[PDB]
Amino acid sequence: GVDFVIHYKVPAAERDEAEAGFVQLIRALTTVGLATEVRHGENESLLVFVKVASPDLFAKQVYRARLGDWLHGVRVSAPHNDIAQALQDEPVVEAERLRLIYLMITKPHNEWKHVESIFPLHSHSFNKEWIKKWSSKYTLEQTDIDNIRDKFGESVAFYFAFLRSYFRFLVIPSAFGFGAWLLLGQFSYLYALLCGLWSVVFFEYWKKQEVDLAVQWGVRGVSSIQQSRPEFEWEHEAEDPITGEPVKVYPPMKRVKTQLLQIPFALACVVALGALIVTCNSLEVFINEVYSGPGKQYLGFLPTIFLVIGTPTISGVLMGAAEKLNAMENYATVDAHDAALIQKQFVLNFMTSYMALFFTAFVYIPFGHILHPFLNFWRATAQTLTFSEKELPTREFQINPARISNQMFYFTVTAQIVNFATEVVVPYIKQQAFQAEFLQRVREECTLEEYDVSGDYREMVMQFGYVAMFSVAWPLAACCFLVNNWVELRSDALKIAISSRRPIPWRTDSIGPWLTALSFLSWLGSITSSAIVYLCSNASPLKAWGLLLSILFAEHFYLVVQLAVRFVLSKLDSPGLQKERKERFQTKKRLLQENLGQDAAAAPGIEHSEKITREALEEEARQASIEMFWQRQRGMQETIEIGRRMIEQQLAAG
């Protein structure tokens, strides 16, 4: 087990001594302002190792951070004891340390004229047992995730918390999915109902989990605390309606107006990628279904090649517009800026993942006769490329309903197998291609790209869409994903350790933009599943009422289930909110105790009716010192006897 003695590493690129010298000078000038530097130069770049020296001054600032999170209400309970050191009964976590030091570096104390990067070093002692403990376990448990938060941060931890919860919830659709395949058969208007029910439950259950996880880890509402973006544009300056501190304001409704440009942008993405995919599918159909002579196996790869080149090209242009629109929307914090860029990308992600299936489930199988003009276009086009005047050999276009079965097999099996290779082996091959001791490790680590949690998130989010929308045509899909995900926990944990550098500890109280992404796929999957069932069942397909009634019920079945699930979950206890409420209440009570001396809420008693009587006297006396208004038959019994006399009096009349 190799050890480390450094907190952070900062490499400064060396181009020309004029600017590179200036870079090294003032960078050093600033770091020593609060932190120690040892600078050994390797791999053509000087490496500025930075760690916190004084632990007394550091524990003084970590404690100040604990207080800060409390003051804005992120942290439920004040660190009231005021003993900075004995408050390490809740010790400084490695993630908490690395984050706060990274703050000191990357607060307004730096960012510095093209510094290559800033990153902490891994812990091989920890990384070894990590992949070991998880490869021995069949089932992970919350303590493991808490450990992940401790070394890496909540941003990384939440993914594994999500992946884990999604894995176990993925057991259920694997059950009645296998059951639907075994008994009910394909295109079941029953598996579809169970699918929507499940998607609602898992999602609504996960949202409840994020709250509890935020409370346990103490990051609830951390989204509205992080440093604002440098390139955030502000018109004027006012006071924070909560803190009272000077905050820079930008009209929220003016941002809303700019965000309306996502509607034509999304349409631009659906058209661009959509046309690209529907075209390559038309080639796929023409060369396979419509023969076209020898070399078919060679030609079979041709439409696939168009996808490989076209997808990054077409979407690459669209992303430039996405990145451009993103800045225009002008987000205050870095958290919101990247979360919105992901939402913009999701439209591209949706197209490049499902449009092949939409083409099959709504155009190919249920109709297909509308593909004839597309086929003829390739007929004449193939004739020109042939150079020979003779027509290419042709056979009748025959609709194959097994197309939806083969494509689904790829997405659930083959594409997941080439995934394991691309996500792990290809970066591992890259390392093999590259092929004191600390410094050598430092250089090798310095290469590796920063771990992007977004990449791992969509892989599972897009996969969920396959279940929610198109698994009704392949009910064994949940089973394939369930197996992959068990490996996915291990595999993703493995690539963080060796295929990527240690990411900066970063905090969030949710999976973020992926929530709405999941919510959309689940809803669309209620329409998608039922419509597919009706159309791909294969009586004449009366699109008029037949398709629409099927969608009407299943979509409304989804909506009713949603209200039902939320209602039930709303009457269940939530530890995260309850943990908050109990602490807040005791804090409220203790203050009450202190001021009013442990008399916190007796009854006066009847004997004190004498003091009531004496007080009633005093009003009379003051009034006397000063007509029907002040009439009183004082005394307890005196009023009783009068009424009693009235009792027999009133019966006398009768």
Residue of the chain from 2, 64, 113, 312 that contacts a second copy (CB under 8 A) = 64
Helix (H), strand (E) at residue 271: helix 262-289
Quick check: 593 binds a second copy (CB under 8 A)?
Answer: no
Helix (H), strand (E) at residue 247: strand 246-249
Q: How far is the CB of 463 from Ca ion (least distance, A)?
A: 9
C-beta closer to a second copy: residue 81 or 384: 81
Quick check: 372 binds a second copy (CB under 8 A)?
Answer: no
515 binds, among a second copy, Ca ion, none (CB under 5 to 8 A by kind): none
412-451 positions binding Ca ion, by CB under 5 A: 419, 423
C-beta closer to Ca ion: residue 311 or 500: 500
Terminal Cα-to-Cα distance of the chain (whole angstroms): 105
534-563 positions binding a second copy, by CB under 8 A: 542-545, 548-549, 551-552
C-beta closer to a second copy: residue 179 or 546: 546
8 A C-beta contact, residue 477 and residue 408: yes
451-480 positions binding Ca ion, by CB under 5 A: 456, 459
Quick check: 555 binds Ca ion (CB under 5 A)?
Answer: no
Is 456 labelled a binding residue? yes
C-beta closer to a second copy: residue 39 or 495: 39
Is 459 labelled a binding residue? yes
The residues, any chain, with a CB within 8 Å of residue 527's CB and separated by 6 or more, are: 551, 554, 555
Q: How far is the CB of 37 from a second copy (least distance, A)?
A: 5
Closest CA to 405 of 192, 195, 194, 185: 185
Phi-psi region of 247 (alpha: psi -120 to 50; beta: other; left: phi over 0): beta
Quick check: 578 binds a second copy (CB under 8 A)?
Answer: yes
- The amino acid sitting at 110 is N
C-beta closer to a second copy: residue 401 or 546: 546
Quick check: 588 binds a second copy (CB under 8 A)?
Answer: yes
46 binds, among Ca ion, a second copy, none (CB under 5 to 8 A by kind): a second copy
8 A C-beta contact, residue 472 and residue 191: yes
Long-range contacts of the stretch 169-173 (C-beta < 8 A, 24+): 169/198, 169/201, 169/202, 169/205, 169/206, 170/467, 170/478, 170/481, 170/482, 170/485, 171/482, 172/198, 173/198, 173/467, 173/471, 173/478
> Segment near a second copy (CB under 8 A), from 368-376, 457-465, 471-479, 600-608?
600-608
> Segment near a second copy (CB under 8 A), from 38-46, 121-129, 351-359, 488-496?
38-46
Can you spell out the DSSP letters for 346-399? HHHHHHHHHHHHHIIIIIITTT-GGGHHHHHHHHHHHHHHH-SSSPPP------
Q: How far is the CB of 581 from a second copy (least distance, A)?
A: 4
Number of amino acids touching a second copy (CB under 8 A): 102
In the three-class reduction of DSSP (H, G, I as helix; E, B as strand; rest coil), residue 209 is classed as: helix
Quick check: 67 binds a second copy (CB under 8 A)?
Answer: yes
194-223 positions binding a second copy, by CB under 8 A: none
Q: How far is the CB of 72 from a second copy (least distance, A)?
A: 8
The residues, any chain, with a CB within 8 Å of residue 352's CB and separated by 6 or more, are: 273, 277, 311, 315
The C-alpha R_g of the chain, in whole angstroms, comes to 34
Residue of the chain from 5, 370, 539, 652 that contacts a second copy (CB under 8 A) = 5
Helix ranges (H only) for 452-597 are: 453-470, 477-498, 514-535, 548-570, 575-596
Residue of the chain from 39, 229, 443, 458 that contacts a second copy (CB under 8 A) = 39
Q: How far is the CB of 341 from a second copy (least distance, A)?
A: 18
- Give the CA distances from residue 653 to residues 136, 159, 639, 641, in Å, rounded to whole numbers and listed in that order: 96, 86, 22, 19
C-beta closer to a second copy: residue 244 or 373: 244
Helix (H), strand (E) at residue 36: strand 36-42
8 A C-beta contact, residue 365 and residue 541: no
Is 82 labelled a binding residue? no
Residue of the chain from 183, 585, 590, 593 that contacts a second copy (CB under 8 A) = 585
C-beta closer to Ca ion: residue 423 or 509: 423
Closest CA to 87 of 582, 520, 269, 96: 96
411-440 positions binding a second copy, by CB under 8 A: 436, 438
Binding residue ranges for Ca(2+): 419, 423, 456, 459, 488, 492
Please give the residue ranges that form the binding site for Ca ion (CB under 5 A): 419, 423, 456, 459, 492
